[PDB]
Design a protein around this ligand. Structure first.
Ligand code: NAG
Ligand code: NAG
Ligand code: NAG
Lengths: 194, 127, 189
């Protein structure tokens, strides 16, 4: 019954989201519930809501200070409990609005995107990972590490008269909030000149 | 309570991560310059003493800030990182006066982050 | 009464005022620090058009609440009390140096004697529409992913951190603008 959890901050308000699921997806989750206790503002515990193969809770109860016990329960029996802090399991939200503009004057491509964490109250420092490769055939992705929402790709670095695929992801970089890479953004494509 | 046994660096991390932001949310819409600054503090233990007082000791006009999210986090940080703080906890229980008082808290928390800056509280040379 | 407070580089506090009503007069400035109950009068006045317009206090790197009052003789016209560091203006970055490595640069400078500051480097090539920026806790900012083949204009400044000093501080003035193409200094860009 081993499991994982991740938190996401200020999702649809001042409310945070906690998501958990079993490592083994071939598990009959019949009557198994997830309960989080501790590090909550007004209550001792919260029970997560099941949706197909995942469990979640959207709430404002998290203190974001101190550890919580997350338990897999069958009735009142604890099958497995793990202690973890909501502030150390933060999955960043994926960037969006990825755009590439070819600048002939500069002999480069200007890449821009929107970083949702910048609009949040907490966690205002994330590291971005931009990946690109030709849209046709198999290639090892070229990765660019950034701390801002723009980068340039010099023309000389890309093959001419070719179509490229580009995507981006983010991870918390903060001395308090720690966690996981976001999912990749949807991919954008662009064409290189002669 | 004596705030000299606190993990100040851990408390500082908690302030900068979330508490600072929650105080700003509470004060939203007020002019920075709108409240006169009246409450001061010196060292980190003294600042925590004054933060303690203003956040949890009930004043007149502002009966309770204790239920506020910034206060609940402050109580959480002090219970985790100040040993014997929860063993000394007393076990029984927006106004234009609360905004004044929260403005005072913001200054103390900020002063808690400047412990190395000198003040009028002087005379300390040695051998 | 309109007022301005500047705490220059944690050295000097300057409080300036203007009030058209009290033009035919010298308004007096009285101050004290926290606890030091009796007010003292200003011993360093700024004048404008022959009349008092400000005061200079030697603050000697001290972080306190300055309590002050401006008076039309005995009658107080304006009274306020503010944490002095809230009006901090750090000094301009000194001894700014650049070290290049292929498509990267490391900008260093003399750090100030006080903490919780952000040393910001702004840069652009003629192809950029706005200044791009990178900042750090110390004056050692590394900007990777640039183009050795392009000319870049650069300038540095010091800001106080809002979480520690509050929102009303002043950034330092920017240091001298320098131009760089292929790891060598240039005149124009
Ligand atoms: C408050 O309650 C808890 C549990 O009863 C106890 O540990 C704590 O020390 C009490 N406070 C005082 C001052 O006795
Ligand atoms: C002086 O008054 C004018 C408006 O009359 C204002 O623009 C200026 O900033 C005031 N000076 C100070 C020190 O704020
Ligand atoms: C105001 O003070 C200046 C000197 O600081 C002096 O020249 C002037 O006569 C004074 N004005 C009045 C109203 O006395």
């Amino acid at each position: 019954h081993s499991f994982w959890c991740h938190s996401q901050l200020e999702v649809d308000g001042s409310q945070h989201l906690l998501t958990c699921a079993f490592n083994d997806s071939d598990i009959n989750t019949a009557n198994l519930e997830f309960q989080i206790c501790g590090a909550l503002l007004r209550v001792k515990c919260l029970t997560l809501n099941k949706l197909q193969d995942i469990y979640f809770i959207k709430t404002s109860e998290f203190l974001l200070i101190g550890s919580s016990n997350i338990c897999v329960k069958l009735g009142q029996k604890n099958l497995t409990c793990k202690n973890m802090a909501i502030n150390t399991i933060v999955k960043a939200e994926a960037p969006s609005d990825l755009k590439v503009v070819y600048r002939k004057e500069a002999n480069d491509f200007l890449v821009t995107f929107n970083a949702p964490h910048l609009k949040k109250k907490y966690l205002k420092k994330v590291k971005h990972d931009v990946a690109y490769r030709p849209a046709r055939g198999e290639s090892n992705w070229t990765h660019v590490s950034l701390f801002h929402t723009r980068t340039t790709i010099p023309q000389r670095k890309l093959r001419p008269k070719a179509m490229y695929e580009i995507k981006v992801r983010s991870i918390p970089h903060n001395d308090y909030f720690k966690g996981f890479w976001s999912e990749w953004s949807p991919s954008s494509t662009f064409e290189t000149p002669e | 309570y004596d705030f000299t046994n606190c993990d100040f660096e851990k408390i500082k991390a908690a302030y900068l991560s979330t508490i600072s932001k929650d105080l700003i949310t509470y004060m939203s819409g007020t002019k920075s310059t709108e409240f006169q600054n009246t409450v001061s503090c010196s060292n980190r233990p003294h600042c925590l003493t004054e933060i303690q007082s203003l956040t949890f000791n009930p004043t007149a006009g502002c009966a309770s800030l204790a239920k506020e999210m910034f206060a609940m986090k402050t109580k959480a940080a002090l219970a985790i990182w100040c040993p014997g703080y929860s063993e000394t906890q007393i076990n029984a229980t927006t106004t234009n006066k609360c905004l004044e008082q929260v403005s005072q808290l913001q200054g103390l928390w900020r002063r808690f982050n400047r412990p190395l800056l000198k003040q009028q509280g002087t005379k300390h040379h040695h051998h | 009464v309109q007022i301005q407070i500047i705490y220059f580089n944690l050295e000097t506090v300057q409080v300036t005022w203007n009030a058209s009503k009290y033009s035919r007069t010298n308004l007096t400035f009285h101050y004290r620090f926290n606890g030091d109950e009796a007010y003292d009068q200003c011993t360093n006045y700024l004048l404008q058009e022959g009349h008092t317009s400000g005061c200079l206090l030697d603050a000697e790197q001290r972080d306190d609440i300055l309590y002050f009052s401006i008076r039309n003789g005995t009658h107080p016209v304006f009274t306020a009390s503010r944490w002095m560091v809230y009006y901090l203006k750090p000094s301009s970055p000194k001894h700014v140096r650049f070290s290049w490595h292929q498509d990267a640069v490391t900008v260093t400078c003399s750090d100030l004697s006080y903490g919780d500051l952000l040393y910001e480097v702004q840069y652009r090539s003629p192809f950029d529409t706005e200044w791009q920026s990178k900042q750090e806790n110390t004056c050692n900012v590394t900007i990777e992913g640039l183009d050795a083949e392009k000319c870049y204009s650069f300038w540095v400044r010091v800001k106080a951190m809002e979480d520690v000093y509050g929102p009303d501080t002043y950034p330092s003035d920017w240091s001298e603008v320098t131009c760089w193409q292929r790891g060598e200094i240039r005149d124009a860009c």
